[PDB]
């Protein structure tokens, strides 16, 4: 009944310390070892290090001297401190659980969602959302496409929902372009029955955690 979730994704300037925090809900900090891992191309899938509940830690020999894993049993959390990071530390960081007891038959059951930590010399930039309006009237009757364009943001990722997750069918979010400027941009599009335009309200919810910015744009037909 255990569920894990690490802190929101973000950008870390080069040589600055990376700090993450995984939160555990559905049990106590006992009965499990609490591990930090990461995944990326180049590095593949590697294990960073785990902590007990007593405070006993064990780190990856290649990563230690830069790694500091802590535990807060008072609030059911455990943290990771990757000291001095560079662009080669850009990866998706996972927090996972290990079964207590012997460590020779231990494994990684229960993983979090994983968060994209990007390392660059650049700065965080919030996105600009624009309504990709549909037509006004024609179909008698079936399917008009409307969406929104998330423009010029950094770094990844950006999540897009519609009507706060109430509209899921017909929704399609596309991967972003890494533009010439080094900034990202993506589009989300829903296909809805065109008779709904004018009676049904369509709102795209764009979340960009790296800049702590949430933008709800309401898309409505043209003229």
């Amino acid at each position: 009944q255990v569920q894990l979730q690490e802190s929101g994704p973000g950008l870390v300037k080069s040589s600055e310390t990376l700090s993450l925090t995984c939160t555990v809900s559905g049990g106590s900090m006992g009965g499990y070892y609490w591990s930090w891992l990461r995944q990326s191309p180049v590095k593949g899938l590697e294990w960073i290090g785990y902590i007990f509940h007593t405070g006993h830690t064990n780190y990856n020999p290649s990563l230690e001297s830069r790694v500091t894993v802590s535990v807060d049993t008072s609030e059911n959390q455990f943290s990771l401190r990757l000291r001095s990071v560079t662009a080669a530390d850009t990866a998706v960081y996972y927090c996972a659980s290990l079964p207590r007891g012997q460590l020779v038959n231990a494994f990684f059951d229960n993983w979090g969602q994983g968060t994209l930590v990007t390392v660059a010399s650049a700065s965080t930039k919030g996105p600009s959302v624009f309504p990709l309006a549909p037509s006004s009237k024609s179909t008698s009757g079936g399917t008009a496409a409307l969406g929104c364009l998330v423009k010029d943001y950094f770094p990844e990722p950006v999540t897009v929902s519609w009507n706060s997750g109430a509209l899921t069918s017909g929704v399609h979010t596309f991967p972003a372009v890494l533009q010439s400027s080094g900034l990202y941009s993506l589009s989300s599009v829903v296909t809805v029955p065109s008779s709904s335009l004018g009676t049904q309200t369509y709102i795209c919810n764009v979340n960009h955690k790296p800049s702590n910015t949430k933008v709800d744009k309401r898309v409505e037909p043209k003229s």
Binding site: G44, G114, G147, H172, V177, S187
Partner: protein
């Protein structure tokens, strides 16, 4: 410490897939396997050589002998197309993962792409910028050609295009953006997005109205 797996393996629906992990020793140790689909976190499928947690279907099996650990997928279904990682240790360096193996299911008939062309939004034009958005979805295989048109002359500059990414449909999706100045957009009579897939081409067109 290297845990080596074949980088790719293909099986038709119904065939048995065989993925192995190799490394010293390793039979003295317990090996475990993880499944991972695009945009997802790894899922434990096999632990302690052969044991399988509840929920994981019977068709997944595991063995471990000498230098080799092996994951076996009997009666492979389309939903089993993912990346597979073997995991063990070597407490001289502790927990290690394999190189990973991409399992492909084959089949999957050719699918013509759906193209949708969006003209610059008014609020963006008011911000003295223009962006034409060409959305391409639901196509297989993932190899397309995007060409833009000013009236009836091909556009060279301002074009950015994603690399085709497999959706949850096992079909691909891509998107091409054309960056323009407002007065450029208002200059020409029409702009066009042209998507070529295999031998068939689609051409959507927008105009300032």
């Amino acid at each position: 410490y290297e845990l080596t797996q074949p980088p790719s393996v293909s099986v038709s629906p119904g065939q048995t897939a065989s993925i192995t992990c190799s490394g010293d020793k390793l039979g003295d140790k317990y090996a475990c396997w993880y499944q991972q689909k695009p945009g997802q976190s790894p899922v434990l499928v096999i632990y302690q050589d052969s044991k399988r947690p509840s929920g994981i279907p019977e068709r997944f099996s595991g063995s471990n002998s000498g230098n080799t650990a092996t994951l076996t997928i009997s009666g492979t279904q389309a939903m089993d197309e993912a990346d597979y990682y073997c995991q063990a240790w070597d407490s001289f360096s502790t927990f290690v993962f394999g190189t990973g193996t991409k399992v492909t299911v084959l089949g999957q008939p050719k699918a013509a792409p759906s193209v949708t062309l969006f003209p610059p939004s008014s609020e963006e034009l008011q911000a003295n910028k223009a962006t034409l958005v060409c959305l391409i979805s639901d196509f297989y295989p993932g190899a397309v050609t995007v060409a833009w048109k000013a009236d009836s002359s091909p556009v060279k500059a301002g074009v950015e295009t994603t690399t085709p990414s497999k959706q949850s449909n096992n079909k691909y999706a891509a998107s091409s953006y054309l960056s323009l100045t407002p007065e450029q957009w208002k200059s020409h009579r029409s702009y066009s997005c042209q998507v070529t897939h295999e031998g068939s081409t689609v051409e959507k067109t927008v105009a300032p109205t």
